[PDB]
Amino acid sequence: TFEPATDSPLPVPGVQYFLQHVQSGKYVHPHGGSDMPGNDTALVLHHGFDEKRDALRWVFVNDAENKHQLKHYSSGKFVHPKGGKVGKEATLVVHSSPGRPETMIEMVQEDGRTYLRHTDSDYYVHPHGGSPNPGDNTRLVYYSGYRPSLAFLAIPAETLFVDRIEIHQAQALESINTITSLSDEHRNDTDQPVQTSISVALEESLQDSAQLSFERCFGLKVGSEFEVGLPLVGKTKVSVQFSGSWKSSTIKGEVRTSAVKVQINEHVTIPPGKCVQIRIDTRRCTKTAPATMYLRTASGIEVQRETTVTSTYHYDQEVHVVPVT
Ligand SMILES: CC(=O)N[C@@H]1[C@@H](O)[C@@H](O)[C@@H](CO)O[C@H]1O
């Protein structure tokens, strides 16, 4: 299963998220839930959720213009300490004023969980009163230190398009192997040559597969199925069709074009008194590489996600009639 505390993805800057306090399940809203909250309106936790509500959406900003800020998607307001100083019980509020070093806020990983933290400080984001299950409309504050109960989950709140995945060629590992299948023995106990049907079923032996793996979870929404060209043996690209969920730590990939045969059917003239076998020799490329996924928002920002590509691919099949003596 997806374990929200141990699998929570780190948010990608410029992408829309919902913020969820893991322990309560409550979401981060401006107080009053407006899409146009006022200056010095508090961030609070509330059970309320509606995928379609833009006032629920937040965007992590980290660019030349703004370093380590959090933005309210519907209003464009940044998240500030109330009064302009991060300190004990300083309420998080939205405000139209641009961000500063003294307002920095980012999601960070500490001992396997994701937390909101004022950058370059020991201040993290707590629910006022520090309850593992705060009540609706509890305000979020800055406070020294962190503990599991404060963990947040950034849930992707828009669907991206996967443009391409680029293998890191220098750390790409390749293990080539020969899968050898022998049919049953067939013997010709007549006094004339018999042309005999010999079949072998190799569906489970020669199953092709591709996997994208992530330390926590993919953490992006990209649709039901997506297709990319992956180099499944040497540098030769093959079309792989992936389906998963943002919560997946492993996305399974299907190979469209099979390069070998999984049903072997040979017509073999067996001479009088002779025994034969079909020998199938199939090559398997077992591959692993770090890779960068390149994805696009509808708003047109290109974003990246590191992954590990793993694949089993079968090529260069040979069939031979071997004598059984
Ligand atoms: C020991 C303890 O839980 N203290 C918490 C403190 O850590 C912080 O979460 C604060 C925020 O208001 O609430 C307090 O109750």
Residue numbers in the entry: 4 to 328
Text from the published report:
TrefLec was searched for original domain combinations, which led to single out SaroL-1 in the choanoflagellate Salpingoeca rosetta, that contains both β-trefoil and aerolysin-like pore-forming domains. Recombinant SaroL-1 is shown to bind galactose and derivatives, with a stronger affinity for cancer-related α-galactosylated epitopes such as the glycosphingolipid Gb3, when embedded in giant unilamellar vesicles or cell membranes. SaroL-1 is composed of two domains, a β-trefoil domain at the N-terminal region shown in blue and an elongated domain (green) consisting of seven β-strands forming a twisted β-sheet.
Attempts to solve the crystal structures by molecular replacement were unsuccessful. Thus the selenium-methionine variant of SaroL-1 was expressed, purified, and crystallized for experimental determination of the phases. The monosaccharides N-acetylgalactosamine (GalNAc) and α-methyl galactoside (GalαOMe) displayed a similar millimolar affinity with a Kd of 2.2 and 2.8 mM, respectively. Clear electron density for three GalNAc monosaccharides is observed in the lectin domain, corresponding to the three sites α, β and γ, classically observed in the β-trefoil structure. The axial O4 of αGalNAc establishes hydrogen bonds with the side chain of conserved His and Arg residues in all sites.
